[PDB]
């Protein structure tokens with residue numbers, strides 16, 4: 001009906017604007033902001049370019065084909081539009097596959113969160129991705145290797161008013177495997193390992209940076225004490241000069257209340273070392289430390305770092321339950337203390353770690369780990385949007401009558417909307433948030 005055409009036109013127009021303005025904002029943020037110029041952000045630029053080309057040259061011509069119920073652009077632009085459409089989908093999943101592999105080599109290296117590729121090498125990878133995917137998309141379509149031999153297809157090719165994607169059963173299987181399924185199986189398997197390595201490689205140093213935080217300026221403790229860096233207490237006295245005196249002496253320099261990232265790490269490596277030293281000295285804490293595994297030993301050091309050797313020793317009943325490998329009974333007594341009431345969010349994480357003996361409580365807490373979850377959402381959404389289309393595409397090869405034309409176009413458009421979702425998912429990263437609000441002048 002008339003109301004269904006007007007309504008569809010408005011919706012389709014807003015989808016185009018969201019994809020164009022959205023991906024324009026992403027590319028501009030990376031190109032101007034110095035901190036956003038990383039190897040990982042170079043692959044995101046490749047992904048944003050494909051979504052922008054999709055919203056300017058693919059989605060507009062596809063919208064006109066639905067509203068007019070005919071093709072008014074000829075047979076040359078039909079085959080060229082189809083070639084660009086495929087190239088955009090092929091390059092996007094292969095770019096997401098390269099990110100999964102690069103993030104694996106980085107997490108398994110001593111650099112931990114830095115790509116082993118240079119900015120010059122990454123530029124070559126992105127260029128190779130587009131050149132190779134450009135050949136597998138344009139050549140089988142322009143050479144007419146895709147064309148079906150049935151009468152309904154031959155008539156559509158000859159007609160200048162028909163641009164319906166009719167393919168031979170050989171092309172539909174070969175082009176789906178190499179363009180979509182091959183990078184998808186690799187991307188899923190490789191990135192499931194990246195999430196595994198990150199959780200497994202968590203230590204006491206990463207644990208306390210989550211609980212205590214990192215501040216290079218003298219701040220106020222939850223108990224009103226003077227603190228600097230990763231939970232390093234300066235003094236109990238309410239004197240900023242005495243707090244500056246304890247800081248200026250410990251480093252042996254003119255601090256003036258401000259310290260560097262290299263200086264804060266130097267103090268932390270000494271505090272953790274002293275926390276382990278205190279346990280071996282204490283006769284009540286030492287036999288508990290020996291009966292605990294690697295994960296649970298870190299949970300005890302965390303308590304000593306916070307409350308002190310004498311403080312933790314006061315949990316006479318809880319320490320006994322930990323020594324007898326009774327985790328849930330120790331957990332109830334630890335909850336019934338002033339420690340749980342002072343820092344509930346921190347104590348909840350330490351007590352759960354004593355119960356499970358895993359890093360389940362510190363899941364995606366670290367800033368470097370949150371960046372891995374963000375990339376994981378991008379890969380997940382892309383799979384959720386394009387999988388129903390490619391599955392129905394393979395089912396159509398087995399049995400032709402089961403899938404209707406109206407079902408095919410609807411599933412293809414779910415994949416089209418995905419080109420406008422990626423810029424919204426980049427708002428998870430604080431670096432992009434500050435860049436987006438600057439470009440929008442907010």
Ligand SMILES: CC(C)CCC[C@@H](C)[C@H]1CC[C@H]2[C@@H]3CC=C4C[C@@H](O)CC[C@]4(C)[C@H]3CC[C@]12C
Nearest residue numbers: 042043045046049050053084123124126127130
């Ligand atoms: C529709 C077709 C014809 C257009 C294809 C656009 C091509 C030329 C685009 C898409 C993605 C682009 C790349 C995206 C990311 C970067 C990182 C930057 O540090 C240097 C340029 C480089 C490597 C771009 C070069 C050009 C590129 C390969």
Ligand SMILES: CC(C)NC[C@H](O)COc1cccc2ccccc12
Nearest residue numbers: 082085086089165172175176179412
């Ligand atoms: C309507 C048509 C022009 N849209 C094409 C899709 O959005 C992209 O789908 C595809 C992408 C890559 C390979 C493929 C092989 C066979 C069939 C479809 C493929």
